[PDB]
Structure formats: structure tokens, C-alpha cells
Ligand code: HEM
Ligand code: HEM
Ligand SMILES: Cc1cc(N)nc(CCc2cc(CCN3CCN(C)CC3)cc(F)c2F)c1
Ligand SMILES: Cc1cc(N)nc(CCc2cc(CCN3CCN(C)CC3)cc(F)c2F)c1
Ligand SMILES: C[C@H](O)[C@H](O)[C@H]1CNc2nc(N)[nH]c(=O)c2N1
Ligand SMILES: C[C@H](O)[C@H](O)[C@H]1CNc2nc(N)[nH]c(=O)c2N1
Ligand SMILES: [Cl-]
């Protein structure tokens with residue numbers, strides 16, 4: 001059992017939950033690959049069996065009538081159909097567990113508070129679209145954001161997958177330019193080109209909300225424009241730098257990841273978008289300051305009259321902090337839920353403590369948990385962490401194109 | 402079997418073929434990543450052989466007369482004595498390689514430029530102190546710092562170790578109070594109480610340079626007052642925050658680590674202090690702003706009239722950046738070599754590309770390479786890295802008590 005130390009406080013725990021880590025990560029005793037971004041009925045049975053065990057442990061019914069009955073039910077379903085179906089309460093529990101198990105999520109103190117929309121009866125991309133609109137509407141909640149997941153039909157033999165081709169429900173277009181540059185968000189050039197290829201009439205702004213490309217089983221993806229009133233946005237301004245507003249910067253309220261695969265008991269839901277609310281660094285540091293994203297850092301620094309010709313002025317660090325301030329101020333001014341990196345890491349520390357008492361540990365990816373600015377100012381920097389894969393889980397999956 | 406390594410900023414891909422040589426198993430398994438953890442007879446011949454091979458291949462003299470002949474000499478030396486002595490050029494080579502192989506060192510672009518003082522003819526702490534003093538003065542060089550290592554005699558059975566008890570050659574004292582809390586550096590309370598135990602009279606200050614505890618083999622440690630004119634310190638002032646000087650903050654010029662064991666070709670050097678120059682975040686972010694270190698962050702923010710009542714003002718971030726500005730400014734004004742985290746990480750990327758061409762990869766500990774402020778503002782943040790143990794190496798070792 002790995003000993004885990006907190007270096008700010010000196011406290012020591014042992015991550016006993018790691019001994020249950022099912023699927024294998026990328027590291028070996030020879031070499032650590034922790035920094036990498038991307039790391040048969042009987043086996044379906046044993047995964048299902050383990051998850052059912054988890055579920056019945058959660059409802060304090062381990063080794064009971066209902067429990068063995070369910071185990072029995074699932075085996076007979078797998079023998080008769082090659083798969084099985086989650087009860088609604090198992091689906092809700094499985095989606096919360098997937099979030100709880102997600103090692104790169106710093107927002108996991110909230111894991112128990114997740115609204116699960118069961119769209120497993122979804123019949124078409126049109127119906128998929130309506131479920132998504134209602135997810136966006138519920139989660140956004142006029143800026144008082146609520147965490148939600150909508151679970152579309154599971155992967156099953158004989159039919160294709162439901163897929164949302166967009167990486168998030170709300171994403172800004174990235175248009176390749178006349179001089180090789182990108183207008184808008186360079187992370188989204190690929191999905192943008194797919195949208196245009198699929199009949200979308202592009203804009204040419206920097207913050208053009210993308211249409212959804214929604215794929216029903218064994219179907220070409222179908223284009224759907226999001227009702228503009230469903231997409232809550234936040235114009236960005238800085239509390240004391242009034243020129244900042246003339247940047248014309250915006251971000252959207254709702255972070256809704258739509259390209260990940262939800263795995264529960266060996267069942268796979270390739271389409272199960274989930275949303276919570278932003279941590280400000282995601283927007284202010286990564287989305288706005290990454291050189292390969294909007295890349296506003298130097299322009300903000302020039303505007304702040306910082307000395308950008310020497311690194312030792314820390315012009316980057318100063319301009320980045322003010323961009324993060326602008327994000328936090330703007331979302332608070334718009335009354336859109338947002339959490340700064342200090343509050344978020346502070347709640348994650350309570351999560352680790354809750355999880356140590358609850359499960360004997362907590363799978364966490366230090367490199368993703370530590371925020372991208374002010375790392376060692378947050379308490380997670382000084383927390384050793386054990387990274388491992390537990391199921392139920394959100395998994396990456398290939399792009400359907 | 403050759404890890405794909407991606408840079409997520411430019412999109413470039415390398416394969417770390419050097420990882421295949423990893424000797425000492427690290428702490429990670431396919432089951433769980435422990436990458437964020439701080440602290441994870443004739444077998445001497447197999448390491449010696451490989452090291453002698455490294456030396457001669459590095460000088461294009463593999464499979465040659467001197468190579469074959471040196472192989473016999475070490476073979477014969479171990480045969481008669483059970484160990485061997487490094488040739489001067491080999492010791493130089495091994496020290497440079499151990500630095501080059503240090504995965505947590507961001508300044509390895511400098512690995513080729515290292516002054517190696519050979520102290521293998523040493524005995525008694527008085528000789529150690531002279532060697533240490535020659536090192537400090539050469540390394541300090543009136544602020545024009547020069548990388549240097551002093552290699553005291555190797556370990557051999559029966560004979561007690563040469564050990565410097567201090568973690569660094571320059572450390573500030575840490576004093577408990579009528580309330581248990583620490584005056585000075587809480588990182589050195591242990592060695593502060595040990596020096597005090599060995600007949601040192603404590604000061605009253607927050608920046609008392611500790612005395613050295615030098616351990617001759619099988620002899621008890623011996624206190625030594627460092628000559629005050631040999632300990633170059635930098636008073637901390639801020640370029641535009643006039644009141645910063647009045648905080649009385651100081652840091653010393655020379656980061657000289659004196660607790661790590663140098664391993665070269667199977668030989669172990671428990672006393673081998675190495676020094677270079679500071680990266681500004683080491684002082685300004687970790688030493689001054691860690692909560693378990695000088696913990697000055699709030700004091701500076703109060704002086705800046707920042708809103709410490711809400712985390713989302715990012716007062717912590719703003720205060721930290723100005724402390725880092727004051728470190729860089731103060732060292733540059735004192736004309737003491739220092740490097741900001743942008744310059745250091747940029748050079749490290751250059752180092753990675755060099756090592757890719759030279760050796761097919763580079764052991765790098767992502768969590769230690771990425772600086773503790775403005776992580777994603779540096780290129781190393783977006784660079785995937787592979788971490789593994791190569792020899793020769795700097796290794797941690799137990800405290801000699
Ligand atoms: C409610 C507030 C939430 C906060 C503050 C939050 C915070 C974060 C942050 C900052 C990341 C880093 C991702 C990146 O840098 O791209 C992340 C990742 C992640 N979050 Fe959370 N999140 C929240 C809600 C949720 C919800 C509701 C779910 C699932 C139901 C979830 C599941 C995940 C997963 C799977 C990742 C992994 C990212 C990846 O591997 O690409 N999060 N979260
Ligand atoms: C010349 C300028 C140098 C710079 C700018 C530099 C920078 C750094 C930094 C920032 C760290 C992080 C460690 C921490 O935060 O505690 C580090 C670690 C390290 N450095 Fe360098 N360093 C330099 C010279 C050297 C030299 C000359 C050697 C050996 C001959 C060396 C060997 C190491 C080792 C072994 C570590 C690992 C520290 C540990 O594991 O605790 N460095 N360096
Ligand atoms: C629900 C939620 C809350 C919140 N606060 N933020 C987010 C966005 C972060 C996020 C991003 C992703 C995409 C990951 N990238 C990695 C780099 N690769 C090149 C492209 C894909 C997946 C998430 F699962 C995820 F959560 C989501
Ligand atoms: C040569 C050089 C250049 C430079 N820029 N910085 C340094 C200091 C970094 C450094 C720090 C350490 C100690 C790290 N932890 C160990 C546990 N302890 C409780 C807290 C501090 C060991 C090094 F071997 C080492 F190198 C050295
Ligand atoms: C190479 C490195 O793994 C990559 O830049 C990671 C580092 N940590 C991260 N952490 C978060 N939260 N999000 C990210 O996208 C990344 N990117
Ligand atoms: C727990 C975590 O690994 C620990 O705080 C590490 C993180 N990264 C670090 N990086 C450097 N350069 N120095 C450190 O002391 C640490 N501490
Ligand atoms: Cl995002």
C-alpha cells in the first residue's frame with residue numbers, strides 16, 4: 001500500500017483503494033508515463049458483477065436477496081442477449097461513481113450532487129438533440145449552474161453507437177485563415193471543418209458557437225444548431241482594466257464534455273455528455289493564454305504596459321493573473337457559477353480526506369489536479385497523489401470520424 | 402515498447418528510446434502511478450563495466466585499447482580489493498552524467514559545464530571544511546555563480562561515511578518559540594536543533610546562516626562556522642514597491658545541496674555537495690511563500706493593500722508574482738546569477754531537443770520540471786515527459802542519524 005504524504009502539513013495516509021485499480025495505466029517500474037495526456041461475455045460478466053457489488057454496497061445490501069438476484073439476473077441476461085440493462089438507480093449510482101473515480105477532476109467534492117438524465121430510450125438524433133437542449137437548459141439554470149449528465153443508449157450488438165461528435169456541447173468555431181492562422185478557437189478547427197462539410201454555414205467571428213453534429217446508430221451525423229437563447233455566455237471585462245472589455249472576449253457558462261465514454265459495469269455509453277461549472281483557470285489560463293489556443297497573453301501584457309522584451313519582468317505571470325481576475329470578475333458579475341483555483345483545490349483537499357475515510361484513498365492525477373497557474377500556492381501541490389483507474393469511469397474514446 | 406512523447410503546444414512527436422536503459426526500478430506499476438511522490442558483493446562489477454562503457458563511447462573510444470585495458474584494470478582492482486578507484490576523467494564524466502541524468506533538474510542545459518573538485522584524498526572534517534570552503538568561494542565567484550561539485554571519498558565497507566549533515570551548505574536557522582512555532586526557516590528546524598545541540602549559540606534572527614556539521618568517517622560531527630564573507634547573500638527589495646526592502650527578507654546566493662549521494666559506476670559518494678544557481682521560483686515561490694516555509698504571502702499582500710478576504714481576488718497570485726519579481730530584481734541588482742522560470746524552462750526545452758538527438762530521449766520528472774507558478778505559461782507544461790532512473794545518478798539517502 002503506497003504511503004502518501006502531504007508536505008505542507010506532514011500528514012501521512014496509505015492509499016489502500018489503489019489495490020483495487022482494475023484497468024492498467026501506462027507506467028511500469030522501468031519508467032513513469034504519468035504526464036501522458038492519453039495513458040467476450042465472461043469479462044463483461046466480471047465487470048458487471050463488480051459494479052453490482054459496488055451498487056449493493058452503497059445501498060447497504062451487500063450479500064442480500066436483491067443482490068444475488070441481481071447478479072443472477074445479469075448473468076442470465078448476458079447469456080441470453082450478450083449484454084444487460086442497468087436499473088435506473090444503478091445508472092444514477094454508476095454515473096456518480098464515474099465522476100467520483102475520475103482522477104483528473106479537481107471538482108470531485110461535488111460528485112454526489114449530479115443530476116442524471118436517463119435518455120437511454122433515445123430513438124434518433126432529433127430526440128438526442130432535444131435531450132441535449134434540456135440538459136443545457138437545466139444545467140445552465142440562468143447562471144446558477146447545476147451538475148448534470150445525460151446518458152444516451154448504451155453500445156449494443158447489432159446497432160451503431162450514439163455519438164456526439166463535438167468535444168463539448170458549447171464550443172467556439174476555429175476558422176483556418178488566409179495566412180495559415182486560426183480565427184476563433186484553434187482547438188476546434190477539426191470539428192469546425194466537419195460542421196462546414198456537413199452543411200453548416202460558417203460565421204467568421206472569434207466566438208461563434210458551433211452547431212452540434214449528432215450521430216444516431218448506423219447514421220451519418222446530423223447537424224443541429226443550438227438555440228442561441230440556450231447558450232449562456234459571459235462577456236469578459238476586468239474590474240480595473242477598462243480597456244480589457246475592448247478585447248471583445250467572451251466565454252460560455254457551461255462546460256459540457258460530450259466526447260467521453262461512460263463505462264458502468266462493463267456497459268459502455270459512448271454518448272453521455274456531462275457538465276458542471278468552470279474553474280476560472282480553465283478559461284483564463286488555458287483557453288485564453290495557451291499559445292495554441294486564443295493566445296491573448298502577450299497582447300494583454302502589451303496593453304498592461306508590461307515590459308515584454310525580458311522574461312524576468314514576469315510579464316507573462318502578471319498578465320495571466322489579471323486575465324484570471326477578469327474571468328472571475330466577469331462570471332461573478334454575470335452571476336454565472338465559477339470557482340477560482342484556490343477554492344477548488346481547497347475543496348479537493350476535503351474530497352481527498354472524505355475519500356480517505358470513505359474508501360481508503362482517492363485516485364488523483366497530480367499533474368491535472370494542480371492548477372496551471374500558482375501551483376504551489378494551492379494545497380494540492382504539496383499533496384502526494386496515487387493515480388489509478390477505477391470503474392465506473394469516464395474514458396477517452398476515438399473521434400467517430 | 403518505445404514511449405511516444407507528444408508536445409501538445411506544437412504537435413510534435415518523439416520516441417524516448419533512452420528509457421529502455423532504465424536500471425533502478427521506480428515506484429510506478431501498471432496498476433498505479435506514484436510519479437508525484439517526493440521520495441519514491443560483486444554486483445559492483447556490472448555497474449562499473451557499463452559505466453566504463455559509457456565513458457569510452459562518450460569519447461568515441463569504445464572497442465579500443467584504452468577501453469579494453471581500462472576494463473581489465475577495474476576487473477583486477479575489484480578482484481584484489483573488492484572495489485575500484487575512478488580515474489580523474491571518469492569521475493568528471495560521472496559527475497556530469499549524474500547531473501545530466503537528474504530527472505528533476507530543469508537546468509540541465511548546463512550539464513556539460515561543471516567544475517569537479519576531486520576531494521577523494523580527504524580525511525577529517527577539517528579537510529572537508531577546507532574543500533567545502535574552496536567550493537563555496539569558487540562557486541560563488543562574487544555573484545557570477547559557477548556550477549561545481551566537490552566529491553569526497555567514496556564509500557567502502559567497514560569505514561564510516563563522509564557526510565555533510567546539512568541539507569545545503571547555506572541554510573537559515575529555524576527556532577521554536579514559547580508557542581512552538583518557528584522563527585526563521587521551518588525547513589531546517591531539525592538541523593538547527595542539531596547544530597544548537599553541538600555547541601552552537603543560536604541567533605535571534607530569521608536569517609541566521611546555520612553552521613556546518615561535517616562528519617568524518619566513524620567520527621562524530623564537528624561544528625564549523627562558515628566564514629561570513631564567503632556566504633554571499635542578497636537583501637530582497639522590489640523594483641517599485643518601496644516598502645518591500647523593509648520586510649527584511651534575504652536569501653543566499655549559492656544553492657549547494659549537501660545531502661545527496663553521488664553514484665558512479667557502482668561506487669557511492671555520500672558526501673558530494675553540488676551547486677549551481679537559483680531559479681527565481683525556488684526562492685520567491687517555494688522558500689518564501691510555501692505555508693511550511695517562510696510563508697510570507699499574506700504579509701506581502703497586506704502590504705500591497707490586496708483583498709485577502711476573498712480567494713477570488715487572486716491576492717495570493719498577485720503577491721507571489723511580486724515576491725518573484727523582487728527576487729529576480731534583487732539578485733540582478735546584486736549581480737548574482739539567477740534565472741527566471743520562463744528562461745529556465747525554455748532552455749530545458751532546448752535541452753530536451755538536444756538530448757533527443759544525442760541520446761534518444763531524456764528522463765524528466767514533469768511535476769518537478771514545471772515551475773510552481775505559471776506552470777502552463779511555460780513550454781514544459783505542454784510537453785509530455787518520461788521519467789526513469791539512469792546511472793550515474795544523484796540519489797537521495799537517509800539522514801545520518
Ligand atoms: C461541478 C463543478 C466541476 C468542476 C469545478 C470541475 C473541474 C474540473 C477541471 C478543472 C478539470 C480539468 C480538465 C482540463 O483541464 O481540461 C476537470 C476534469 C474532469 N472532470 Fe471535472 N469539474 C466539474 C464537474 C464535473 C462533472 C459534473 C463531471 C462528470 C459528471 C466531471 C468529470 C470530469 C472528468 C472525467 C474530467 C477528466 C478530464 C479529462 O480527462 O480530459 N467533472 N474537472
Ligand atoms: C546551474 C544551474 C542550475 C539550475 C538553474 C538548477 C535548477 C534546478 C531546480 C529548479 C531544481 C528543483 C529542485 C527543487 O525544487 O528542490 C533542481 C533539482 C536538481 N538539480 Fe539542478 N539546477 C542547477 C544546477 C545543478 C547542478 C550543478 C547539479 C549537479 C551537479 C544539479 C542537480 C540537481 C538534482 C540531483 C536535482 C534533484 C533535486 C531533488 O531530487 O531533490 N543541479 N535543479
Ligand atoms: C464537466 C467539466 C467541468 C469543468 N470545470 N471543466 C470541463 C472541461 C475540461 C474537460 C476537458 C476534456 C477534454 C480533454 N482534452 C484533453 C486534451 N485533448 C487534446 C483534447 C481533450 C474532457 C473532460 F472530461 C473535461 F472535464 C468539464
Ligand atoms: C544545484 C542546485 C541548483 C538549484 N537551482 N537548486 C538546488 C536545490 C534543489 C534541491 C533540493 C533538494 C531537497 C528537495 N526537498 C527534499 C526534501 N526536503 C524535506 C525538502 C526539499 C535536494 C537537491 F538535491 C536539490 F538539488 C540545487
Ligand atoms: C503534457 C501535459 O501532460 C499536459 O500539458 C497536461 C498537463 N496537465 C494538465 N492539467 C489539466 N487540468 N488539463 C490539461 O490539459 C493538462 N495538460
Ligand atoms: C507532492 C509533490 O510531488 C511535491 O509537492 C513536489 C511537487 N513538485 C515539486 N517540484 C520541485 N521542483 N520541487 C519540489 O519540492 C516539488 N514538490
Ligand atoms: Cl474548456
Ligand SMILES: [Cl-]
Pocket residue numbers: 656683684688
Ligand atoms: Cl533552496
Ligand SMILES: [Gd]
Pocket residue numbers: 240241242
Ligand atoms: Gd483603470
Ligand SMILES: [Gd]
Pocket residue numbers: none
Ligand atoms: Gd488590438
Ligand SMILES: [Gd]
Pocket residue numbers: none
Ligand atoms: Gd499604506
Ligand SMILES: [Zn+2]
Pocket residue numbers: 027031032033034429430433434435436
Ligand atoms: Zn507513473
